[PDB]
Design a binder for this molecule. Structure first.
Ligand SMILES: [Ca+2]
Ligand SMILES: [Ca+2]
Ligand SMILES: [Ca+2]
Ligand SMILES: [Ca+2]
Ligand SMILES: [Ca+2]
Ligand SMILES: [Ca+2]
Length: 298
């Protein structure tokens, strides 16, 4: 039987006798030479891989075929190894037994690659998010990769360390797309920091966890709100009659209120009133990015 087939573990060490070929009565004949003439290395994609003639060897005398250099399925998933045997001075008198042997050698997978995060080298994701993002908005998409065959490198994504629970979720437990299932608010959360965990479906499962920091950006989405709904012969001219006050639940100059009135007179800073009402946020920025409430006063 010249043409055999044998499977091997990629983790199988050098020298590990994988196979054994013989001639008929190779023991009646001690003067036989077994030789590896060519090696043909290919991917799990059937693609071809050059310069792999160093991968196996044969014992010249016994024809036991063993590994010579360490393998890796993620580089080469199958070899076709060609062998000859040479009778010394007998058959084919002037000296080979052809048909040659074709040993087919399939490399069985060991779950030895643990998931990586694209882009390669990433320690953390940070991106920057603007509030009011609608629930079911893709907030950020991470992803990851496993080299190993079938199960051993089917990647599945888990989400941990979730700062307020229930705020975001993976839409689908087989893709690192983080959606929000609560409308995004700076006036609740300044940071949605969580930890994404990709894992293979390996016999003992290998995985990886990496943090995901999402910086939450303020927008002018809160009016200034006044304290009271309404604030109600001749005194001295400067003396202050009453202060008013409003608050604006945003932060970065989107809280600075400019207090103003129709008639009299006012102070934009304090909200104080003198003698001869409105609140407006974000001064120094265009009207269309401002908001306001109006109180009455007697
Ligand atoms: Ca490997
Ligand atoms: Ca592998
Ligand atoms: Ca794996
Ligand atoms: Ca808000
Ligand atoms: Ca805001
Ligand atoms: Ca505001």
């Amino acid at each position: 039987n010249p043409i055999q087939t044998v499977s091997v573990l990629e983790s199988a060490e050098p020298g590990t006798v994988i196979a054994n070929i013989t001639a008929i009565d190779h023991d009646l004949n001690p003067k036989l030479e077994y030789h590896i003439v060519g090696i043909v290395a290919k991917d799990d994609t059937d693609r071809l891989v050059p310069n792999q003639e160093d991968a196996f060897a044969v014992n010249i005398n016994t024809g036991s075929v063993m590994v010579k250099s360490p393998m890796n399925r993620e580089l080469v998933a199958t070899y076709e190894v060609t062998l000859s045997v040479i009778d010394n001075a007998s058959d084919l008198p002037e000296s080979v037994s052809v048909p040659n042997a074709k040993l087919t050698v399939n490399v069985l997978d060991v779950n030895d690659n643990t998931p990586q995060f694209k882009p390669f080298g990433i320690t953390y994701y940070m991106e920057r998010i603007l509030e009011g993002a609608t629930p079911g908005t893709t907030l950020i998409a991470v992803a990851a990769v496993d080299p190993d065959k079938g199960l051993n490198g089917l990647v599945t994504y888990t989400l941990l360390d979730l700062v307020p629970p229930g705020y975001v979720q993976l839409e689908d437990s087989s893709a690192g797309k983080v959606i929000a299932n609560r409308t995004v608010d700076y006036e609740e959360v300044h940071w949605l920091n969580f930890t994404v965990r990709a894992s293979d479906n390996g016999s003992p499962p290998r995985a990886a966890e990496i943090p995901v920091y999402l910086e939450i950006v303020d927008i002018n989405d809160n009016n200034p709100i006044f304290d009271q709904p309404s604030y109600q012969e001749d005194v001295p001219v400067g003396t202050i009659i009453l202060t008013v006050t409003a608050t604006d639940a945003d932060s970065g100059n989107f809280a600075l209120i400019e207090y103003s009135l129709g008639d009299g007179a006012i102070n934009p800073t304090t909200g104080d009133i003198y003698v001869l009402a409105l609140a407006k946020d974000n001064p120094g920025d265009v009207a269309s990015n401002r908001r306001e409430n109006s109180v009455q006063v007697v």
